[PDB]
């Protein structure tokens, strides 16, 4: 608390009443999402910041209750966001909640300690976006931190929730460190090949093509 | 046809409206589903015998187009059967039909021969008619009459079958309790389709998936599958 509860938490599309918890990708900062939340207008966006503390799983689970206290919950990830998704939800479970689906971009789960930070960092050198004073003053240590996060992180154990895997138009190679999410869910387990590199998935065209994807996604019942 | 239209494929829950197109395991016979057919009380299941003529894939076309004229199809296999159905979905899709999916029973596309190492088709014959020694489906003058020399041509077929392509079609996979590494001739069903692989974890052994209490638990997973809507 302190200043405000809503802290390290981005709210898109407010007056829409289905929520989908989004981690962001390793640059860290939820207002990446900006974009793809104008393709998923039926869907209200409570996009995350990388919370840097070693307890900020706690804190997650905390805002998400606050944001979404009943119910099955649909959790969103790209890029090192996959990762914290997959993480969150293991918190969330064992907290009692159901977690009814995570939906991953492009990346896989951490299997080992031993990369897209880069290409990241290029794609917004210059985003009017990122340049705000409040994110200006803790871009680099948020990304650092976010990206030590990911290279140390080995994710263990199994989510019941069903996961769902948009896959880059580009071929690719499963490093050693890195395995499918087959395994990691008791669950269903769904891919779908998008289009567009990894790191240009959600913006600019390439977006358009693959919201249409993560929509059948989100439209999905049993 | 000939004096039998419906020789090679055996009807069940007839009297429901939605059917599902499947494929045999490898022992070639379409009755070995009818446990699996009380499971899927909903379904009318259209389960096919192997069809040893060269041409099956077109028989397996005209059989379908005649039982199922309009609308989209759901196709299903098991064992080997998960192979002819994906060869027969893009025959299908190929003249114009929608496979609105194909649902595979812990079997995977095949990518290159099968490797049987130190053995032969023969022996290998011999012990998939073993596995399934006792089993009411395989009784019968009509199924013991032919089931060695459908057996071998089917498994024929899947060792020397190798799979290219894509269908538009969705593939769910059920896949076995027990572990298993994927050999270097086969592979997994992610890019046979530019529609979206799902798999799940089910229960039991590969051969012990469709029958007995394994089969109850599995039987909901794959009312799942079916039941999907988007």
Same mark, same amino acid.
């Given at each position: 608390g302190g200043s405000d509860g809503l802290q390290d938490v981005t709210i898109m599309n407010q007056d829409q009443e289905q929520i989908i918890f989004a981690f962001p990708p390793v640059l860290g900062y939820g207002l990446m999402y900006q974009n793809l939340s104008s393709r998923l207008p039926s869907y209200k966006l409570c996009a995350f910041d990388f919370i840097e503390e070693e307890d900020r799983l706690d804190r997650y #689970? !905390?805002?998400?209750? +606050?944001?979404?206290?009943?119910?099955?919950?649909?959790? $969103?990830?790209? /890029? #090192?966001?996959?990762?914290? *998704? $997959?993480? *969150? #939800? =293991? +918190?969330?479970?064992?907290?009692?909640?159901? &977690?009814?689906?995570?939906?991953? &971009? !492009? /990346?896989? =789960?951490?299997?080992?300690?031993?990369? !897209? &930070?880069? *290409?990241?960092?290029?794609?917004?050198? !210059?985003?009017? @976006?990122?340049?705000?004073? @409040?994110?200006?003053?803790?871009? +680099?240590?948020?990304?650092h931190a976010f990206y030590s996060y990911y290279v140390n992180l080995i994710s263990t154990g199994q989510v019941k929730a069903d996961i769902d895997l948009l896959t880059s138009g580009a071929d690719f190679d499963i490093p050693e460190w890195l395995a499918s999410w087959e395994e990691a869910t008791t669950g269903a387990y769904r891919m779908k090949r998008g289009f567009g590199t990894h790191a240009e998935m959600l913006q600019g065209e390439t977006l358009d093509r693959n919201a249409g994807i993560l929509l059948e996604f989100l439209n999905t019942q049993t």
């Amino acid at each position: 608390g302190g200043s405000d509860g809503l802290q390290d938490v981005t709210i898109m599309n407010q007056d829409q009443e289905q929520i989908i918890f989004a981690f962001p990708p390793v640059l860290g900062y939820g207002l990446m999402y900006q974009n793809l939340s104008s393709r998923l207008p039926s869907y209200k966006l409570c996009a995350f910041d990388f919370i840097e503390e070693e307890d900020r799983l706690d804190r997650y #689970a !905390d805002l998400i209750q +606050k944001l979404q206290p009943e119910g099955p919950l649909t959790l $969103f990830g790209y /890029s #090192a966001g996959c990762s914290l *998704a $997959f993480e *969150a #939800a =293991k +918190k969330l479970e064992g907290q009692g909640r159901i &977690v009814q689906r995570i939906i991953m &971009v !492009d /990346s896989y =789960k951490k299997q080992g300690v031993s990369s !897209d &930070v880069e *290409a990241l960092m290029n794609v917004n050198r !210059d985003n009017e @976006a990122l340049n705000s004073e @409040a994110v200006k003053h803790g871009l +680099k240590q948020k990304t650092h931190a976010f990206y030590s996060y990911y290279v140390n992180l080995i994710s263990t154990g199994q989510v019941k929730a069903d996961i769902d895997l948009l896959t880059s138009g580009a071929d690719f190679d499963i490093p050693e460190w890195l395995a499918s999410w087959e395994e990691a869910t008791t669950g269903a387990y769904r891919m779908k090949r998008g289009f567009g590199t990894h790191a240009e998935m959600l913006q600019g065209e390439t977006l358009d093509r693959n919201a249409g994807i993560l929509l059948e996604f989100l439209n999905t019942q049993t």
